[PDB]
Amino acid sequence: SEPFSLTEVQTAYMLGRNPQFELSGISPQTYFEYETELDIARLSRSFQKVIQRHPMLRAVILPEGKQQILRDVPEYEIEVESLVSMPPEKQAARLREERSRMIDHVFPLGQWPLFELKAFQLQEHTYLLCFRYDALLMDGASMNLVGQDLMHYYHQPDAQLPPLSFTFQDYMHIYDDMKRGTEYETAKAYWTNKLPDFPPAPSLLLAKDPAEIGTPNFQSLTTIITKDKWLKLRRLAQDKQVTPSALLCTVYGEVLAFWSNQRRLAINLTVFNRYPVHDEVEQIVGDFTSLILLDMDMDQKQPFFTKVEQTQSTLLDGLEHRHYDGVEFIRDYTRYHQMRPKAVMPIVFTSMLAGAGAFAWEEIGSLRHIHARTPQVYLDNVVIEKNGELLVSWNYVEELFDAEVMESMFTQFVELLDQLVEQGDINPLRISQKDYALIDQYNATAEPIP
CATH class of the missing domain: 3.30.559.30 (Nonribosomal peptide synthetase, condensation domain)
Structure with missing residues:
Protein backbone atom coordinates (compact mmCIF):
# COMPACT_ATOMS: atom_id res chain seq x y z
CA SER A 1 0.00 0.00 0.00
CA GLU A 2 3.00 2.24 -0.69
CA PRO A 3 4.45 3.88 -3.81
CA PHE A 4 6.98 2.01 -5.93
CA SER A 5 8.70 2.21 -9.30
CA LEU A 6 7.53 1.39 -12.83
CA THR A 7 8.68 -1.29 -15.23
CA GLU A 8 10.55 -0.39 -18.41
CA VAL A 9 7.27 -0.47 -20.34
CA GLN A 10 5.22 1.12 -17.54
CA THR A 11 7.78 3.89 -17.97
CA ALA A 12 7.14 3.71 -21.72
CA TYR A 13 3.39 3.65 -21.06
CA MET A 14 3.62 6.96 -19.19
CA LEU A 15 6.09 8.36 -21.73
CA GLY A 16 3.49 7.47 -24.37
CA ARG A 17 1.15 10.09 -22.87
CA ASN A 18 3.34 12.93 -24.22
CA PRO A 19 1.85 14.39 -27.43
CA GLN A 20 5.21 15.90 -28.45
CA PHE A 21 6.24 12.51 -29.88
CA GLU A 22 4.64 11.12 -33.02
CA LEU A 23 1.54 8.97 -32.41
CA SER A 24 1.75 9.70 -28.69
CA GLY A 25 -0.26 11.65 -26.14
CA ILE A 26 -2.74 8.92 -25.12
CA SER A 27 -2.83 6.42 -22.36
CA PRO A 28 -2.72 2.76 -23.43
CA GLN A 29 -6.20 1.38 -22.81
CA THR A 30 -7.97 -1.95 -23.25
CA TYR A 31 -11.69 -2.21 -24.03
CA PHE A 32 -14.06 -5.18 -24.11
CA GLU A 33 -17.86 -5.42 -24.32
CA TYR A 34 -19.98 -8.52 -23.67
CA GLU A 35 -23.67 -9.44 -23.76
CA THR A 36 -24.50 -11.37 -20.59
CA GLU A 37 -27.38 -13.17 -18.90
CA LEU A 38 -25.91 -12.61 -15.43
CA ASP A 39 -27.07 -10.36 -12.61
CA ILE A 40 -25.34 -6.97 -12.61
CA ALA A 41 -25.95 -6.54 -8.87
CA ARG A 42 -24.30 -9.88 -8.08
CA LEU A 43 -21.40 -9.03 -10.40
CA SER A 44 -21.14 -5.64 -8.67
CA ARG A 45 -20.85 -7.27 -5.24
CA SER A 46 -18.42 -9.91 -6.49
CA PHE A 47 -16.42 -6.96 -7.85
CA GLN A 48 -16.13 -5.42 -4.38
CA LYS A 49 -14.64 -8.75 -3.28
CA VAL A 50 -12.00 -8.83 -6.03
CA ILE A 51 -11.08 -5.19 -5.33
CA GLN A 52 -10.22 -5.96 -1.70
CA ARG A 53 -8.69 -9.33 -2.63
CA HIS A 54 -6.09 -8.05 -5.10
CA PRO A 55 -4.37 -4.91 -3.74
CA MET A 56 -3.11 -3.83 -7.18
CA LEU A 57 -6.73 -3.26 -8.22
CA ARG A 58 -6.75 -0.51 -5.55
CA ALA A 59 -3.74 1.27 -7.08
CA VAL A 60 -3.17 4.51 -8.98
CA ILE A 61 -0.36 5.78 -11.20
CA LEU A 62 1.60 8.76 -9.83
CA PRO A 63 3.07 11.67 -11.82
CA GLU A 64 6.42 11.11 -10.03
CA GLY A 65 7.19 8.19 -12.33
CA LYS A 66 5.88 5.92 -9.56
CA GLN A 67 2.78 3.86 -8.79
CA GLN A 68 1.08 3.32 -5.43
CA ILE A 69 -1.44 0.85 -4.07
CA LEU A 70 -3.99 2.69 -1.95
CA ARG A 71 -4.64 1.73 1.65
CA ASP A 72 -8.37 1.67 0.87
CA VAL A 73 -10.65 2.89 -1.91
CA PRO A 74 -14.18 4.28 -2.26
CA GLU A 75 -16.81 1.62 -2.85
CA TYR A 76 -17.37 0.73 -6.50
CA GLU A 77 -20.74 -0.10 -8.04
CA ILE A 78 -21.66 -1.04 -11.60
CA GLU A 79 -24.25 1.33 -13.05
CA VAL A 80 -26.74 -0.14 -15.54
CA GLU A 81 -28.66 1.97 -18.07
CA SER A 82 -32.12 0.74 -19.07
CA LEU A 83 -32.63 0.51 -22.83
CA VAL A 84 -35.53 -1.91 -22.36
CA SER A 85 -38.33 0.33 -23.67
CA MET A 86 -36.40 2.02 -26.47
CA PRO A 87 -36.84 1.43 -30.21
CA PRO A 88 -33.91 -0.45 -31.80
CA GLU A 89 -32.68 2.86 -33.25
CA LYS A 90 -32.58 4.57 -29.84
CA GLN A 91 -30.90 1.69 -27.98
CA ALA A 92 -28.16 1.52 -30.62
CA ALA A 93 -27.52 5.26 -30.25
CA ARG A 94 -26.95 4.98 -26.49
CA LEU A 95 -24.68 1.95 -26.92
CA ARG A 96 -22.47 3.56 -29.57
CA GLU A 97 -22.18 6.82 -27.61
CA GLU A 98 -20.97 5.01 -24.49
CA ARG A 99 -18.39 3.15 -26.58
CA SER A 100 -16.90 6.48 -27.65
CA ARG A 101 -17.17 7.92 -24.13
CA MET A 102 -15.31 4.94 -22.66
CA ILE A 103 -12.55 4.50 -25.25
CA ASP A 104 -11.87 8.25 -25.49
CA HIS A 105 -11.75 8.72 -21.71
CA VAL A 106 -8.31 8.70 -20.06
CA PHE A 107 -7.78 8.13 -16.35
CA PRO A 108 -5.85 10.96 -14.65
CA LEU A 109 -2.55 10.18 -12.87
CA GLY A 110 -3.09 9.95 -9.07
CA GLN A 111 -6.85 10.57 -9.52
CA TRP A 112 -9.07 7.62 -8.38
CA PRO A 113 -9.78 4.24 -10.12
CA LEU A 114 -7.79 3.16 -13.20
CA PHE A 115 -10.72 1.13 -14.59
CA GLU A 116 -14.43 1.44 -15.32
CA LEU A 117 -17.39 -0.95 -15.53
CA LYS A 118 -20.72 0.19 -16.96
CA ALA A 119 -23.74 -1.79 -18.10
CA PHE A 120 -26.81 -1.43 -20.28
CA GLN A 121 -30.17 -3.15 -19.77
CA LEU A 122 -31.04 -4.35 -23.27
CA GLN A 123 -33.79 -6.60 -21.92
CA GLU A 124 -35.03 -6.87 -18.34
CA HIS A 125 -32.73 -9.90 -17.90
CA THR A 126 -30.18 -9.23 -20.68
CA TYR A 127 -27.26 -6.86 -20.13
CA LEU A 128 -24.33 -5.35 -22.03
CA LEU A 129 -21.47 -5.48 -19.53
CA CYS A 130 -18.34 -3.56 -20.52
CA PHE A 131 -14.96 -3.30 -18.79
CA ARG A 132 -12.04 -1.00 -19.61
CA TYR A 133 -8.76 -0.32 -17.85
CA ASP A 134 -5.58 1.67 -18.36
CA ALA A 135 -2.69 -0.58 -19.38
CA LEU A 136 -0.60 0.85 -16.52
CA LEU A 137 -2.93 -1.01 -14.14
CA MET A 138 -2.55 -4.65 -15.17
CA ASP A 139 -1.91 -7.13 -18.00
CA GLY A 140 -4.19 -9.36 -20.04
CA ALA A 141 -3.31 -12.31 -17.81
CA SER A 142 -4.50 -10.19 -14.88
CA MET A 143 -7.74 -9.06 -16.55
CA ASN A 144 -8.67 -12.74 -16.90
CA LEU A 145 -7.55 -13.53 -13.35
CA VAL A 146 -9.90 -10.78 -12.18
CA GLY A 147 -12.69 -12.39 -14.19
CA GLN A 148 -11.91 -15.77 -12.63
CA ASP A 149 -12.33 -14.36 -9.12
CA LEU A 150 -15.38 -12.39 -10.31
CA MET A 151 -17.28 -15.48 -11.46
CA HIS A 152 -16.23 -17.40 -8.34
CA TYR A 153 -17.86 -14.82 -6.06
CA TYR A 154 -20.78 -14.40 -8.47
CA HIS A 155 -21.84 -18.03 -8.00
CA GLN A 156 -20.38 -18.25 -4.46
CA PRO A 157 -20.18 -14.84 -2.74
CA ASP A 158 -19.26 -16.48 0.58
CA ALA A 159 -16.73 -19.09 -0.62
CA GLN A 160 -13.83 -17.04 0.69
CA LEU A 161 -10.65 -17.62 -1.30
CA PRO A 162 -7.23 -18.01 0.32
CA PRO A 163 -5.35 -14.73 0.70
CA LEU A 164 -2.39 -13.62 -1.39
CA SER A 165 1.14 -13.73 0.04
CA PHE A 166 2.70 -11.71 -2.80
CA THR A 167 1.59 -8.58 -4.68
CA PHE A 168 2.77 -6.40 -7.55
CA GLN A 169 4.73 -4.09 -5.23
Whole structure:
Protein backbone atom coordinates (compact mmCIF):
# COMPACT_ATOMS: atom_id res chain seq x y z
CA SER A 1 0.00 0.00 0.00
CA GLU A 2 3.00 2.24 -0.69
CA PRO A 3 4.45 3.88 -3.81
CA PHE A 4 6.98 2.01 -5.93
CA SER A 5 8.70 2.21 -9.30
CA LEU A 6 7.53 1.39 -12.83
CA THR A 7 8.68 -1.29 -15.23
CA GLU A 8 10.55 -0.39 -18.41
CA VAL A 9 7.27 -0.47 -20.34
CA GLN A 10 5.22 1.12 -17.54
CA THR A 11 7.78 3.89 -17.97
CA ALA A 12 7.14 3.71 -21.72
CA TYR A 13 3.39 3.65 -21.06
CA MET A 14 3.62 6.96 -19.19
CA LEU A 15 6.09 8.36 -21.73
CA GLY A 16 3.49 7.47 -24.37
CA ARG A 17 1.15 10.09 -22.87
CA ASN A 18 3.34 12.93 -24.22
CA PRO A 19 1.85 14.39 -27.43
CA GLN A 20 5.21 15.90 -28.45
CA PHE A 21 6.24 12.51 -29.88
CA GLU A 22 4.64 11.12 -33.02
CA LEU A 23 1.54 8.97 -32.41
CA SER A 24 1.75 9.70 -28.69
CA GLY A 25 -0.26 11.65 -26.14
CA ILE A 26 -2.74 8.92 -25.12
CA SER A 27 -2.83 6.42 -22.36
CA PRO A 28 -2.72 2.76 -23.43
CA GLN A 29 -6.20 1.38 -22.81
CA THR A 30 -7.97 -1.95 -23.25
CA TYR A 31 -11.69 -2.21 -24.03
CA PHE A 32 -14.06 -5.18 -24.11
CA GLU A 33 -17.86 -5.42 -24.32
CA TYR A 34 -19.98 -8.52 -23.67
CA GLU A 35 -23.67 -9.44 -23.76
CA THR A 36 -24.50 -11.37 -20.59
CA GLU A 37 -27.38 -13.17 -18.90
CA LEU A 38 -25.91 -12.61 -15.43
CA ASP A 39 -27.07 -10.36 -12.61
CA ILE A 40 -25.34 -6.97 -12.61
CA ALA A 41 -25.95 -6.54 -8.87
CA ARG A 42 -24.30 -9.88 -8.08
CA LEU A 43 -21.40 -9.03 -10.40
CA SER A 44 -21.14 -5.64 -8.67
CA ARG A 45 -20.85 -7.27 -5.24
CA SER A 46 -18.42 -9.91 -6.49
CA PHE A 47 -16.42 -6.96 -7.85
CA GLN A 48 -16.13 -5.42 -4.38
CA LYS A 49 -14.64 -8.75 -3.28
CA VAL A 50 -12.00 -8.83 -6.03
CA ILE A 51 -11.08 -5.19 -5.33
CA GLN A 52 -10.22 -5.96 -1.70
CA ARG A 53 -8.69 -9.33 -2.63
CA HIS A 54 -6.09 -8.05 -5.10
CA PRO A 55 -4.37 -4.91 -3.74
CA MET A 56 -3.11 -3.83 -7.18
CA LEU A 57 -6.73 -3.26 -8.22
CA ARG A 58 -6.75 -0.51 -5.55
CA ALA A 59 -3.74 1.27 -7.08
CA VAL A 60 -3.17 4.51 -8.98
CA ILE A 61 -0.36 5.78 -11.20
CA LEU A 62 1.60 8.76 -9.83
CA PRO A 63 3.07 11.67 -11.82
CA GLU A 64 6.42 11.11 -10.03
CA GLY A 65 7.19 8.19 -12.33
CA LYS A 66 5.88 5.92 -9.56
CA GLN A 67 2.78 3.86 -8.79
CA GLN A 68 1.08 3.32 -5.43
CA ILE A 69 -1.44 0.85 -4.07
CA LEU A 70 -3.99 2.69 -1.95
CA ARG A 71 -4.64 1.73 1.65
CA ASP A 72 -8.37 1.67 0.87
CA VAL A 73 -10.65 2.89 -1.91
CA PRO A 74 -14.18 4.28 -2.26
CA GLU A 75 -16.81 1.62 -2.85
CA TYR A 76 -17.37 0.73 -6.50
CA GLU A 77 -20.74 -0.10 -8.04
CA ILE A 78 -21.66 -1.04 -11.60
CA GLU A 79 -24.25 1.33 -13.05
CA VAL A 80 -26.74 -0.14 -15.54
CA GLU A 81 -28.66 1.97 -18.07
CA SER A 82 -32.12 0.74 -19.07
CA LEU A 83 -32.63 0.51 -22.83
CA VAL A 84 -35.53 -1.91 -22.36
CA SER A 85 -38.33 0.33 -23.67
CA MET A 86 -36.40 2.02 -26.47
CA PRO A 87 -36.84 1.43 -30.21
CA PRO A 88 -33.91 -0.45 -31.80
CA GLU A 89 -32.68 2.86 -33.25
CA LYS A 90 -32.58 4.57 -29.84
CA GLN A 91 -30.90 1.69 -27.98
CA ALA A 92 -28.16 1.52 -30.62
CA ALA A 93 -27.52 5.26 -30.25
CA ARG A 94 -26.95 4.98 -26.49
CA LEU A 95 -24.68 1.95 -26.92
CA ARG A 96 -22.47 3.56 -29.57
CA GLU A 97 -22.18 6.82 -27.61
CA GLU A 98 -20.97 5.01 -24.49
CA ARG A 99 -18.39 3.15 -26.58
CA SER A 100 -16.90 6.48 -27.65
CA ARG A 101 -17.17 7.92 -24.13
CA MET A 102 -15.31 4.94 -22.66
CA ILE A 103 -12.55 4.50 -25.25
CA ASP A 104 -11.87 8.25 -25.49
CA HIS A 105 -11.75 8.72 -21.71
CA VAL A 106 -8.31 8.70 -20.06
CA PHE A 107 -7.78 8.13 -16.35
CA PRO A 108 -5.85 10.96 -14.65
CA LEU A 109 -2.55 10.18 -12.87
CA GLY A 110 -3.09 9.95 -9.07
CA GLN A 111 -6.85 10.57 -9.52
CA TRP A 112 -9.07 7.62 -8.38
CA PRO A 113 -9.78 4.24 -10.12
CA LEU A 114 -7.79 3.16 -13.20
CA PHE A 115 -10.72 1.13 -14.59
CA GLU A 116 -14.43 1.44 -15.32
CA LEU A 117 -17.39 -0.95 -15.53
CA LYS A 118 -20.72 0.19 -16.96
CA ALA A 119 -23.74 -1.79 -18.10
CA PHE A 120 -26.81 -1.43 -20.28
CA GLN A 121 -30.17 -3.15 -19.77
CA LEU A 122 -31.04 -4.35 -23.27
CA GLN A 123 -33.79 -6.60 -21.92
CA GLU A 124 -35.03 -6.87 -18.34
CA HIS A 125 -32.73 -9.90 -17.90
CA THR A 126 -30.18 -9.23 -20.68
CA TYR A 127 -27.26 -6.86 -20.13
CA LEU A 128 -24.33 -5.35 -22.03
CA LEU A 129 -21.47 -5.48 -19.53
CA CYS A 130 -18.34 -3.56 -20.52
CA PHE A 131 -14.96 -3.30 -18.79
CA ARG A 132 -12.04 -1.00 -19.61
CA TYR A 133 -8.76 -0.32 -17.85
CA ASP A 134 -5.58 1.67 -18.36
CA ALA A 135 -2.69 -0.58 -19.38
CA LEU A 136 -0.60 0.85 -16.52
CA LEU A 137 -2.93 -1.01 -14.14
CA MET A 138 -2.55 -4.65 -15.17
CA ASP A 139 -1.91 -7.13 -18.00
CA GLY A 140 -4.19 -9.36 -20.04
CA ALA A 141 -3.31 -12.31 -17.81
CA SER A 142 -4.50 -10.19 -14.88
CA MET A 143 -7.74 -9.06 -16.55
CA ASN A 144 -8.67 -12.74 -16.90
CA LEU A 145 -7.55 -13.53 -13.35
CA VAL A 146 -9.90 -10.78 -12.18
CA GLY A 147 -12.69 -12.39 -14.19
CA GLN A 148 -11.91 -15.77 -12.63
CA ASP A 149 -12.33 -14.36 -9.12
CA LEU A 150 -15.38 -12.39 -10.31
CA MET A 151 -17.28 -15.48 -11.46
CA HIS A 152 -16.23 -17.40 -8.34
CA TYR A 153 -17.86 -14.82 -6.06
CA TYR A 154 -20.78 -14.40 -8.47
CA HIS A 155 -21.84 -18.03 -8.00
CA GLN A 156 -20.38 -18.25 -4.46
CA PRO A 157 -20.18 -14.84 -2.74
CA ASP A 158 -19.26 -16.48 0.58
CA ALA A 159 -16.73 -19.09 -0.62
CA GLN A 160 -13.83 -17.04 0.69
CA LEU A 161 -10.65 -17.62 -1.30
CA PRO A 162 -7.23 -18.01 0.32
CA PRO A 163 -5.35 -14.73 0.70
CA LEU A 164 -2.39 -13.62 -1.39
CA SER A 165 1.14 -13.73 0.04
CA PHE A 166 2.70 -11.71 -2.80
CA THR A 167 1.59 -8.58 -4.68
CA PHE A 168 2.77 -6.40 -7.55
CA GLN A 169 4.73 -4.09 -5.23
CA ASP A 170 6.98 -6.96 -4.13
CA TYR A 171 7.61 -7.83 -7.79
CA MET A 172 8.82 -4.29 -8.50
CA HIS A 173 11.25 -4.36 -5.57
CA ILE A 174 12.73 -7.50 -7.14
CA TYR A 175 12.43 -5.86 -10.57
CA ASP A 176 14.93 -3.12 -9.73
CA ASP A 177 17.26 -5.54 -7.92
CA MET A 178 17.10 -7.91 -10.90
CA LYS A 179 18.41 -5.19 -13.26
CA ARG A 180 22.12 -5.06 -12.43
CA GLY A 181 25.15 -6.72 -14.02
CA THR A 182 26.56 -10.16 -14.85
CA GLU A 183 23.79 -11.75 -16.94
CA TYR A 184 22.77 -8.21 -17.90
CA GLU A 185 26.27 -7.47 -19.21
CA THR A 186 26.31 -10.81 -21.05
CA ALA A 187 22.90 -9.99 -22.54
CA LYS A 188 24.13 -6.53 -23.56
CA ALA A 189 27.16 -8.14 -25.21
CA TYR A 190 24.83 -10.36 -27.25
CA TRP A 191 22.60 -7.49 -28.38
CA THR A 192 25.53 -5.19 -29.20
CA ASN A 193 27.13 -7.94 -31.32
CA LYS A 194 23.97 -8.28 -33.45
CA LEU A 195 23.35 -4.53 -33.71
CA PRO A 196 25.90 -3.62 -36.48
CA ASP A 197 23.76 -5.57 -38.97
CA PHE A 198 20.35 -5.51 -37.27
CA PRO A 199 17.66 -5.01 -39.94
CA PRO A 200 15.30 -2.02 -39.79
CA ALA A 201 11.59 -2.20 -39.16
CA PRO A 202 9.76 -2.88 -42.45
CA SER A 203 9.08 0.32 -44.38
CA LEU A 204 5.35 -0.42 -44.47
CA LEU A 205 3.03 1.54 -46.73
CA LEU A 206 1.67 4.64 -45.02
CA ALA A 207 -0.99 7.11 -46.11
CA LYS A 208 0.49 10.08 -44.21
CA ASP A 209 3.69 11.09 -42.47
CA PRO A 210 3.50 10.34 -38.71
CA ALA A 211 5.23 13.68 -38.03
CA GLU A 212 2.06 15.60 -38.95
CA ILE A 213 -0.26 13.37 -36.89
CA GLY A 214 0.44 14.10 -33.23
CA THR A 215 -2.31 12.49 -31.17
CA PRO A 216 -3.34 9.18 -32.80
CA ASN A 217 -6.88 7.88 -33.23
CA PHE A 218 -7.23 4.11 -33.14
CA GLN A 219 -9.38 1.56 -34.95
CA SER A 220 -9.12 -2.23 -35.03
CA LEU A 221 -9.86 -5.32 -37.10
CA THR A 222 -10.75 -8.49 -35.19
CA THR A 223 -11.29 -12.09 -36.31
CA ILE A 224 -12.15 -14.98 -33.99
CA ILE A 225 -10.77 -18.22 -35.44
CA THR A 226 -12.71 -21.46 -35.05
CA LYS A 227 -11.24 -23.83 -32.47
CA ASP A 228 -10.85 -26.54 -35.12
CA LYS A 229 -8.48 -24.32 -37.11
CA TRP A 230 -6.53 -23.31 -34.00
CA LEU A 231 -6.05 -26.95 -33.00
CA LYS A 232 -4.82 -27.91 -36.48
CA LEU A 233 -2.47 -24.92 -36.46
CA ARG A 234 -1.15 -25.99 -33.05
CA ARG A 235 -0.67 -29.52 -34.38
CA LEU A 236 1.18 -28.03 -37.36
CA ALA A 237 3.46 -26.20 -34.93
CA GLN A 238 4.09 -29.50 -33.14
CA ASP A 239 4.83 -31.36 -36.39
CA LYS A 240 7.49 -28.78 -37.34
CA GLN A 241 9.03 -28.72 -33.82
CA VAL A 242 8.29 -25.00 -33.45
CA THR A 243 6.29 -22.74 -31.18
CA PRO A 244 3.06 -21.36 -32.71
CA SER A 245 4.33 -17.86 -31.89
CA ALA A 246 7.11 -18.41 -34.44
CA LEU A 247 4.47 -19.38 -37.00
CA LEU A 248 2.46 -16.23 -36.28
CA CYS A 249 5.47 -13.89 -36.29
CA THR A 250 6.54 -15.35 -39.64
CA VAL A 251 3.07 -15.01 -41.17
CA TYR A 252 3.10 -11.47 -39.76
CA GLY A 253 6.47 -10.92 -41.44
CA GLU A 254 5.31 -12.45 -44.72
CA VAL A 255 2.59 -9.80 -45.05
CA LEU A 256 4.91 -6.99 -43.95
CA ALA A 257 7.74 -7.95 -46.32
CA PHE A 258 5.20 -8.07 -49.15
CA TRP A 259 3.80 -4.60 -48.43
CA SER A 260 7.11 -2.99 -47.38
CA ASN A 261 9.21 -4.40 -50.26
CA GLN A 262 11.83 -5.61 -47.78
CA ARG A 263 14.28 -8.50 -47.85
CA ARG A 264 15.00 -8.26 -44.10
CA LEU A 265 12.70 -6.69 -41.52
CA ALA A 266 12.66 -6.18 -37.75
CA ILE A 267 9.58 -6.96 -35.65
CA ASN A 268 8.87 -5.64 -32.14
CA LEU A 269 7.55 -8.59 -30.13
CA THR A 270 5.68 -8.00 -26.88
CA VAL A 271 6.53 -10.80 -24.44
CA PHE A 272 5.09 -11.23 -20.95
CA ASN A 273 6.29 -14.16 -18.74
CA ARG A 274 6.81 -11.52 -16.02
CA TYR A 275 9.98 -12.81 -14.32
CA PRO A 276 10.53 -16.07 -12.40
CA VAL A 277 10.80 -14.35 -9.03
CA HIS A 278 8.11 -15.89 -6.77
CA ASP A 279 5.83 -18.90 -6.48
CA GLU A 280 2.51 -16.99 -6.49
CA VAL A 281 3.54 -14.81 -9.45
CA GLU A 282 0.99 -16.15 -11.94
CA GLN A 283 -1.89 -15.76 -9.45
CA ILE A 284 -1.91 -11.98 -8.80
CA VAL A 285 -2.78 -8.77 -10.63
CA GLY A 286 -0.06 -6.57 -12.08
CA ASP A 287 1.55 -5.01 -15.14
CA PHE A 288 3.38 -7.65 -17.21
CA THR A 289 4.43 -5.78 -20.38
CA SER A 290 7.91 -6.15 -21.88
CA LEU A 291 9.77 -5.91 -25.22
CA ILE A 292 12.07 -7.92 -27.53
CA LEU A 293 13.33 -7.44 -31.12
CA LEU A 294 13.45 -10.15 -33.80
CA ASP A 295 16.33 -10.76 -36.26
CA MET A 296 14.48 -11.83 -39.39
CA ASP A 297 15.37 -12.84 -42.93
CA MET A 298 12.62 -13.22 -45.53
CA ASP A 299 15.32 -13.51 -48.21
CA GLN A 300 14.57 -17.18 -48.87
CA LYS A 301 13.58 -19.64 -51.59
CA GLN A 302 12.82 -22.15 -48.80
CA PRO A 303 9.43 -23.29 -47.47
CA PHE A 304 7.55 -21.42 -44.78
CA PHE A 305 8.32 -23.76 -41.88
CA THR A 306 12.09 -23.45 -42.39
CA LYS A 307 11.69 -19.68 -42.17
CA VAL A 308 9.92 -20.42 -38.88
CA GLU A 309 12.79 -22.56 -37.58
CA GLN A 310 15.23 -19.70 -38.20
CA THR A 311 12.63 -17.42 -36.63
CA GLN A 312 12.44 -19.66 -33.56
CA SER A 313 16.21 -20.01 -33.11
CA THR A 314 16.48 -16.22 -33.35
CA LEU A 315 13.48 -15.83 -31.02
CA LEU A 316 15.20 -18.01 -28.43
CA ASP A 317 18.52 -16.19 -28.80
CA GLY A 318 16.79 -12.92 -27.96
CA LEU A 319 14.76 -14.48 -25.14
CA GLU A 320 17.91 -15.97 -23.59
CA HIS A 321 19.32 -12.41 -23.32
CA ARG A 322 16.19 -10.48 -22.30
CA HIS A 323 17.94 -9.10 -19.21
CA TYR A 324 18.94 -6.32 -21.61
CA ASP A 325 15.47 -5.04 -22.46
CA GLY A 326 14.59 -4.47 -26.10
CA VAL A 327 13.91 -0.82 -25.32
CA GLU A 328 17.58 -0.54 -24.32
CA PHE A 329 18.49 -1.99 -27.72
CA ILE A 330 16.26 0.65 -29.34
CA ARG A 331 18.27 3.39 -27.63
CA ASP A 332 21.50 1.84 -28.92
CA TYR A 333 20.03 1.48 -32.42
CA THR A 334 18.86 5.10 -32.31
CA ARG A 335 22.21 6.70 -31.44
CA TYR A 336 24.45 5.27 -34.17
CA HIS A 337 22.16 5.05 -37.20
CA GLN A 338 20.87 8.58 -36.38
CA MET A 339 17.20 7.70 -36.03
CA ARG A 340 16.38 11.00 -34.21
CA PRO A 341 13.11 11.27 -32.18
CA LYS A 342 11.20 8.95 -34.52
CA ALA A 343 9.36 5.67 -34.04
CA VAL A 344 12.18 3.13 -34.33
CA MET A 345 10.25 -0.15 -33.92
CA PRO A 346 6.64 0.78 -34.75
CA ILE A 347 5.85 -2.64 -36.27
CA VAL A 348 4.68 -4.53 -33.18
CA PHE A 349 3.47 -8.10 -32.65
CA THR A 350 1.97 -9.19 -29.33
CA SER A 351 2.02 -12.86 -28.32
CA MET A 352 -0.75 -13.58 -25.80
CA LEU A 353 -1.10 -17.32 -26.35
CA ALA A 354 -2.59 -19.45 -23.57
CA GLY A 355 -5.43 -17.02 -22.95
CA ALA A 356 -6.71 -19.05 -19.98
CA GLY A 357 -7.86 -22.54 -19.09
CA ALA A 358 -11.47 -21.45 -19.61
CA PHE A 359 -11.18 -17.66 -20.18
CA ALA A 360 -13.52 -16.28 -17.51
CA TRP A 361 -13.89 -13.31 -19.88
CA GLU A 362 -16.44 -15.37 -21.86
CA GLU A 363 -18.22 -17.25 -19.08
CA ILE A 364 -20.09 -13.97 -18.57
CA GLY A 365 -21.35 -13.57 -22.12
CA SER A 366 -20.64 -13.36 -25.83
CA LEU A 367 -17.97 -11.07 -27.25
CA ARG A 368 -19.47 -8.17 -29.22
CA HIS A 369 -16.82 -5.43 -29.41
CA ILE A 370 -13.02 -5.34 -29.15
CA HIS A 371 -10.95 -2.16 -28.92
CA ALA A 372 -7.54 -1.00 -27.73
CA ARG A 373 -5.40 2.16 -27.87
CA THR A 374 -1.61 1.84 -27.76
CA PRO A 375 0.85 4.76 -27.98
CA GLN A 376 3.81 4.74 -30.38
CA VAL A 377 2.82 1.93 -32.76
CA TYR A 378 1.93 2.03 -36.43
CA LEU A 379 0.05 -1.26 -36.02
CA ASP A 380 0.00 -3.81 -33.18
CA ASN A 381 -0.90 -7.37 -34.17
CA VAL A 382 -2.01 -9.08 -30.94
CA VAL A 383 -2.87 -12.79 -31.14
CA ILE A 384 -4.54 -14.20 -28.03
CA GLU A 385 -6.23 -17.51 -27.24
CA LYS A 386 -9.84 -17.72 -26.04
CA ASN A 387 -10.84 -21.17 -24.72
CA GLY A 388 -9.56 -22.99 -27.79
CA GLU A 389 -10.53 -20.18 -30.18
CA LEU A 390 -7.87 -17.83 -31.53
CA LEU A 391 -8.48 -14.07 -31.59
CA VAL A 392 -6.46 -11.97 -34.05
CA SER A 393 -6.78 -8.22 -33.47
CA TRP A 394 -4.92 -5.48 -35.37
CA ASN A 395 -4.81 -2.20 -33.45
CA TYR A 396 -3.49 0.54 -35.72
CA VAL A 397 -3.24 4.31 -36.06
CA GLU A 398 -5.64 4.76 -38.97
CA GLU A 399 -4.33 8.33 -39.38
CA LEU A 400 -1.50 6.57 -41.27
CA PHE A 401 -3.12 3.86 -43.40
CA ASP A 402 -5.26 3.46 -46.47
CA ALA A 403 -8.31 1.47 -45.41
CA GLU A 404 -8.03 -0.95 -48.33
CA VAL A 405 -4.36 -1.66 -47.58
CA MET A 406 -4.97 -2.37 -43.89
CA GLU A 407 -7.90 -4.65 -44.73
CA SER A 408 -5.76 -6.45 -47.32
CA MET A 409 -2.87 -6.94 -44.88
CA PHE A 410 -5.35 -8.25 -42.30
CA THR A 411 -6.95 -10.57 -44.86
CA GLN A 412 -3.62 -11.87 -46.18
CA PHE A 413 -2.52 -12.68 -42.62
CA VAL A 414 -5.65 -14.80 -42.12
CA GLU A 415 -5.41 -16.37 -45.59
CA LEU A 416 -1.85 -17.50 -44.83
CA LEU A 417 -3.07 -19.08 -41.58
CA ASP A 418 -5.71 -21.00 -43.54
CA GLN A 419 -3.06 -22.32 -45.94
CA LEU A 420 -0.96 -23.41 -42.96
CA VAL A 421 -3.97 -25.45 -41.81
CA GLU A 422 -4.97 -26.67 -45.28
CA GLN A 423 -1.59 -27.55 -46.81
CA GLY A 424 0.99 -27.03 -44.05
CA ASP A 425 2.84 -24.51 -46.24
CA ILE A 426 1.94 -21.12 -47.72
CA ASN A 427 1.62 -19.81 -51.25
CA PRO A 428 3.15 -16.45 -52.23
CA LEU A 429 1.00 -13.38 -51.74
CA ARG A 430 -1.05 -11.95 -54.61
CA ILE A 431 -3.11 -8.77 -54.96
CA SER A 432 -6.11 -8.00 -57.15
CA GLN A 433 -8.69 -5.57 -55.71
CA LYS A 434 -8.61 -2.13 -57.37
CA ASP A 435 -4.97 -2.65 -58.34
CA TYR A 436 -4.50 -5.51 -60.81
CA ALA A 437 -7.05 -4.15 -63.29
CA LEU A 438 -5.16 -0.84 -63.41
CA ILE A 439 -1.79 -2.37 -64.32
CA ASP A 440 -3.42 -4.86 -66.71
CA GLN A 441 -4.78 -1.98 -68.81
CA TYR A 442 -1.68 0.09 -68.02
CA ASN A 443 0.42 -2.36 -70.07
CA ALA A 444 -2.24 -3.05 -72.73
CA THR A 445 -0.05 -1.09 -75.14
CA ALA A 446 0.37 -3.56 -78.01
CA GLU A 447 0.03 -2.11 -81.52
CA PRO A 448 0.07 -3.81 -84.96
CA ILE A 449 3.07 -2.33 -86.79
CA PRO A 450 5.74 -4.47 -88.53
